[PDB]
């Protein structure tokens, strides 16, 4: 139950069908989603949060797809859910290629810049109360946002 | 030596590194000549089996670092922010900014599917991304980009050097 | 190469330095050898005119430094416009004092995580901070505080004008 959002879950389901990107396996996939939405919420309905708002977008799709051919919305409100999952994959992947390119960089270590001190050197008042603020604030963030 | 002068400075700067340009305005040599010494240097280190250093060029600056092997050792001792990996969320959120740059918080959330508020902060706390432009909407949105540190963190000199969607 | 291994450590330790008994521990070697190893490692830099660094010992702490024959070239670097202003670390340090003073070196280090005696060094040169007693603990470490000039420099007239902060 630890997936990075709804779009992330779709990429898992949409995955299964291998083949190309979509290829009309929608009507099917949609069901699978609600499945985990209702069955898993039968007992533990605590981390729904955002996913919920997604359940909604699907409802309309399943529904509005029933009605016959009256710029069709029964469709656009489908092809768009596809584009969303695709573009998400693209970044879910580009994401990995960064955590990989980073690793190489992380193999190298260096030293904190030696704080030189010279007599003649005079102070430049280019810093202000705002600076000193974000400064201490940051250090607070960095570490605190971690365990 | 000129090799000795370069190392000396490059050492003092450490993690901050120095730019070829700025190295000339200090040694008094042509920017093209530093390039040459800098290569002889990184090579002097390469050969020396008793040397742990290595020259590296990220974000258009040359930085004095440790040869990749000693990472196993140092990993215990250092753990400086640049060697720490990132959470999948920040990693992915970062990717989106990295490319769709300049971008907005909502746009990211949209693309990413969930709320990015948490990542934007963490990433910004690490000086990886910074807010530059502004947005003309019925909300005065803010635009997010990448800092020079982002190049360094990625070990590249120019943004274009990022992998490509193939 | 053990000399390489020691150098990497000595290198990343930065300014505060590293302990023989500690090097031994990390590298799994009797302090006896680490000792002789540092002896040779120090002469290697000495022998080579192309290396800009010589190794030194400060109260049991081994740390790297540049050979004095470069003092001039460095002094110039420290005059370039950039360095004429507080570093990313000197500012980080300066702020921590401003808000948590009185505070000790060890305590300031524990917040930035990294050693920072060298930053504290510059802030005292610019009369931004000063020593004001010694914490009443074992070792009686020095207590650091911002100064009168700090206020001026910051364009303020009392530590109470600093932006509040509560997490």
Curated annotation (Swiss-Prot), chain A:
GO terms for cellular component: cytoplasm. The keyword Cell cycle applies. It comes from the Bacteria. Its main location: cytoplasm. GO terms for biological process: cell division; chromosome segregation; DNA replication. It is found in: Cytoplasm. Keywords: Cell cycle, Cell division, Chromosome partition, Cytoplasm. Coiled coil: none annotated. Belongs to the ScpA family. Participates in chromosomal partition during cell division. May act via the formation of a condensin-like complex containing Smc and ScpB that pull DNA away from mid-cell into both cell halves. Component of a cohesin-like complex composed of ScpA, ScpB and the Smc homodimer, in which ScpA and ScpB bind to the head domain of Smc. The presence of the three proteins is required for the association of the complex with DNA. This is Segregation and condensation protein A.
Swiss-Prot record, chain C:
Gene3D superfamilies: Winged helix-like DNA-binding domain superfamily/Winged helix DNA-binding domain. GO terms for biological process: cell division; chromosome separation; DNA replication. It comes from the Bacteria. Its main location: cytoplasm. It is found in: Cytoplasm. It holds the Pfam family SMC_ScpB. One of its GO terms (cellular component) is cytoplasm. Keywords: Cell cycle, Cell division, Chromosome partition, Cytoplasm. Belongs to the ScpB family. Participates in chromosomal partition during cell division. May act via the formation of a condensin-like complex containing Smc and ScpA that pull DNA away from mid-cell into both cell halves. HAMAP family: ScpB (MF_01804). Homodimer. Homodimerization may be required to stabilize the binding of ScpA to the Smc head domains. Component of a cohesin-like complex composed of ScpA, ScpB and the Smc homodimer, in which ScpA and ScpB bind to the head domain of Smc. The presence of the three proteins is required for the association of the complex with DNA. This is Segregation and condensation protein B. It comes from Streptococcus pneumoniae (strain P1031). The gene is scpB.
């Amino acid at each position: 139950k630890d997936f990075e959002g709804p779009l992330d879950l779709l990429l898992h389901l949409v995955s299964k069908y291998q083949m190309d990107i979509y290829d009309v396996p929608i009507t099917e996939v949609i069901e699978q989603y609600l499945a985990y939405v209702s069955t898993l919420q039968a007992m533990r309905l605590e981390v729904t949060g955002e996913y919920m708002v997604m359940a909604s977008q699907l409802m309309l799709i399943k529904s509005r797809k029933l009605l016959p051919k009256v710029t069709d919305l029964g469709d656009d409100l489908e092809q768009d859910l596809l584009s969303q999952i695709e573009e998400y994959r693209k970044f879910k992947l580009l994401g990995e290629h960064l955590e990989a390119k980073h690793q190489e960089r992380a193999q190298y270590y260096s030293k904190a810049p030696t704080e030189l001190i010279y007599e003649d050197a005079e102070l430049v008042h280019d810093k202000t109360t705002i600076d000193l603020f974000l400064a201490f604030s940051n250090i607070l963030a960095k570490k605190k946002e971690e365990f | 030596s000129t090799l000795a002068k370069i190392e000396a400075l490059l050492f003092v700067a450490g993690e901050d590194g120095i730019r070829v340009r700025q190295l000339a305005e200090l040694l008094s040599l042509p920017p093209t000549g530093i390039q040459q010494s800098l290569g002889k240097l990184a090579q002097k280190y390469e050969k020396d089996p008793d040397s742990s250093l290595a020259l590296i060029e990220t974000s258009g600056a040359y930085r004095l670092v440790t040869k990749p092997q000693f990472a196993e050792i140092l990993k215990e001792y250092s753990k400086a922010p640049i060697n720490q990996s990132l959470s999948r969320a920040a990693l992915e959120t970062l990717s989106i900014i990295a490319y769709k740059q300049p971008i907005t918080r909502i746009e990211i959330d949209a693309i990413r599917g969930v709320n990015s508020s948490g990542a934007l902060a963490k990433l910004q706390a690490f000086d990886l991304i910074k807010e530059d432009g502004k947005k003309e909407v019925l909300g005065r949105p803010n635009l997010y980009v990448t800092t020079d540190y982002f190049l360094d963190y990625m070990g590249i000199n120019h943004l274009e050097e990022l992998p490509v969607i193939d």
